[PDB]
Design a binder for this molecule. Structure first.
Ligand SMILES: CCc1cc2c(cc1OS(N)(=O)=O)CC[C@@H]1[C@@H]2CC[C@]2(C)[C@@H](OS(N)(=O)=O)CC[C@@H]12
Ligand SMILES: [Zn+2]
Length: 258
């Protein structure tokens, strides 16, 4: 009886195995745009993905993830609210069964069709497993997806999903350029939070971009053909793998823009 997103093991159950689920800096949250305050102390944000080295794509049983070589400073996030250098380890998505839901963060209670998370760890802690034990160990760049025009830079991801339909399947996924998944503007909101799945560790500086990317209905439909189950098990479509907004508690969301 492991955690997931079903009726009997979904987000409302997670606290029993992971009591930090009810903690003081849980994610995601609703971003109330009128209350977020512009912070002119924020330094410019820096997304340096030109030397990114993608390796593999994996169906992990709750989403799919594209993994990178993080054994060197090759794809890094710096600047913004961050002190130091954070290395890209993987990206993944959360999405809905219908276009009206799927994102984890919301904006004035609006849900997007999906949300991309580019996960990075602070190089001062040496490895990802040590970084997640630190309050400033991770920086996750969140990007909303809305349904409209296709995102050309996403198509290479969508076309390999057939090959990783079920839990535990992976495929070679080299030479993928994550710059093709970014919107034009790097305007963002930032706040201190957590992993949005178990173990729910409170180790993340969240940086959520204001501008969504557009993906086509066909692209998102292919996400919804994935399976939570393993091969040869009853088919359970991988949809609605998002955690709802959590209490903001004693936090302020800051904006990089006026
Ligand atoms: C190093 C601690 C640890 C973290 C994570 C996992 C296993 C982990 O190891 S363990 N021993 O607890 O099973 C698998 C689930 C992973 C999580 C790191 C944070 C992850 C990438 C999440 O990223 S997110 N949504 O941006 O917070 C979604 C999947 C998460
Ligand atoms: Zn995520």
């Amino acid at each position: 009886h492991h955690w997931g997103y079903g009726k009997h093991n979904g987000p409302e159950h997670w606290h029993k195995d992971f009591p930090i689920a009810k903690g003081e800096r849980q994610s995601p949250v609703d971003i109330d745009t009128h209350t977020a305050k512009y912070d002119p102390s924020l330094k410019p944000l820096s997304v340096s993905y030109d030397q990114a080295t993608s390796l593999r794509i994996l169906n992990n049983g709750h989403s799919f993830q594209v993994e990178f070589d993080d054994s060197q400073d090759k794809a890094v996030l710096k600047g913004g609210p961050l002190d130091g250098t954070y290395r890209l380890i993987q990206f993944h998505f959360h999405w809905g069964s219908l276009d009206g839901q799927g994102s984890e963060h919301t904006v004035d209670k609006k849900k997007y069709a999906a949300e991309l998370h580019l996960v990075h760890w602070n190089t001062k802690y040496g490895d990802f497993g040590k970084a997640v034990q630190q309050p400033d160990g991770l920086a996750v760049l969140g990007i909303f997806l809305k349904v409209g025009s296709a995102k050309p830079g996403l198509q290479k991801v969508v076309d390999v999903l057939d090959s990783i339909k079920t839990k535990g399947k992976s495929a070679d996924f080299t030479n993928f350029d994550p710059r093709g998944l970014l919107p034009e503007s790097l305007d963002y909101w930032t706040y201190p939070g957590s992993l949005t799945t178990p173990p729910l560790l409170e180790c993340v500086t969240w940086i959520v971009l204001k501008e969504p990317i557009s993906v086509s209905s066909e692209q998102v439909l292919k996400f919804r053909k994935l399976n939570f189950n393993g091969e040869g098990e009853p088919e359970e479509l991988m949809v609605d793998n998002w955690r709802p907004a959590q209490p903001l508690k004693n936090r302020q969301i800051k904006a990089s823009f006026k």
